[PDB]
Design a protein around this ligand. Structure first.
Ligand code: NI
Ligand code: NI
Ligand SMILES: [Zn+2]
Length: 349
């Protein structure tokens, strides 16, 4: 039974063989059959022989068009991040800043010590994040887990209508330095996401189980009463940071994991996640779907204040995969209830 698998909803890690690795959608279905989605976040370590790019010594002149200076404001584990756009710069220029004494990773022993330093110094010395860069570092002939062309049913958006949504069905690169953050969020349309750390220092993550996401939302509306009034889904603005000590103090179930260079992280529908970079690094990310995502897409609560513009029409999905509920859904009478513990149907294998 689904409730019986990964009942603690803890972050799982997988080490596929190259044979299991070759079929992306299939391996996602496998890890769900093991309960991985209940944590909201999973690690996949690819076969040691697999490489998405030959070397990264040839990207120093790649342009980061809109680097972001991250000014964080707050106290007692609760923060709001404000973005200041900086002028474009090259990877070379960015690495130099990231590694300069002003911005570099501080000295530490255990990850636990670095984590404490992050939460203590988050609002000081605002760092610059090279975020939302359109592009890919995958070499063109890599066919396994190519973030540029995963061949999931999310492809139906572009295939049927021609619509591309940057970072959603196209890839984004993220150039990190110490103390750059990604605030608490689920993906647009509560999609899955895939995140690969090409090189550099680690990226640390926090995740809340999808079956407990409503609890986190309840806590956040309470602590940011202003934001909650102005938008039905203000966490999608990706400005809200909440420390793990605050999650513990209010009983929000969560887990933490550190991603190292060469590892993938998968986020699952309605899995809230946040985190930070340890130092200079580069990650590549995009969204994807499975059949189980469709019901989350139908039910996603979207930003109401126009700050987050991403909306995908679900009609194509409901028509193709849920023909028996289409008419009901169009009349607003599809009362379907999501069971977050269930794996996607492709996993029945
Ligand atoms: Ni639980
Ligand atoms: Ni995300
Ligand atoms: Zn909004």
């Amino acid at each position: 039974e689904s409730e019986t698998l990964n009942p603690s909803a803890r972050i799982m890690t997988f080490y596929p063989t190259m044979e299991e690795f070759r079929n992306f959608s299939r391996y996602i279905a496998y890890i769900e059959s093991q309960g991985a989605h209940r944590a909201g976040l999973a690690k996949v370590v690819p076969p040691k022989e697999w490489k998405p790019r030959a070397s990264y010594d040839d990207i120093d002149d790649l342009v980061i068009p809109a680097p972001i200076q991250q000014l964080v404001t707050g106290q007692s584990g609760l923060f709001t991040q404000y973005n200041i756009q900086k002028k474009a710069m090259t990877v070379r220029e960015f690495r130099k800043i990231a590694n300069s004494d002003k911005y570099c990773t501080p000295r530490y022993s255990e990850f636990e010590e670095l984590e404490r330093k992050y939460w203590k110094n988050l609002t000081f010395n605002p760092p610059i994040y090279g975020a939302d860069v359109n592009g890919t570092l995958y070499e063109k002939h890599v066919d396994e887990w190519n973030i540029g062309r995963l061949r999931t049913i999310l492809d139906l958006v572009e295939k049927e209508s021609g619509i591309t949504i940057e970072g959603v069905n196209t890839p984004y690169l993220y150039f990190g330095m110490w103390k750059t953050s990604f605030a608490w969020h689920t993906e647009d349309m509560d999609l899955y996401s895939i995140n690969y750390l090409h090189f550099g220092e680690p990226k640390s993550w926090y995740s809340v189980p999808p079956e407990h996401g409503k609890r986190l939302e309840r806590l956040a509306k309470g602590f940011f009463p202003g934001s909650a009034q102005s938008c039905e889904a203000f966490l999608r603005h990706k400005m809200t940071l909440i420390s793990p000590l605050m999650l513990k103090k209010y009983g929000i179930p969560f887990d933490k994991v550190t991603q190292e260079a060469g590892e993938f992280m998968i986020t699952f529908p309605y899995g809230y996640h946040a985190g930070f970079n340890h130092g200079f690094n580069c990650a590549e990310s995009t969204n994807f779907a499975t059949r189980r995502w469709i019901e989350y897409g139908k039910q996603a609560v979207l930003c109401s204040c126009r700050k987050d513009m991403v909306k995908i029409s679900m009609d194509v999905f409901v028509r193709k995969f849920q023909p028996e509920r289409y008419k009901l859904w169009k009349a607003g009478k599809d009362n379907t209830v999501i069971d977050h513990t269930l794996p996607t149907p492709e996993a029945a294998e």
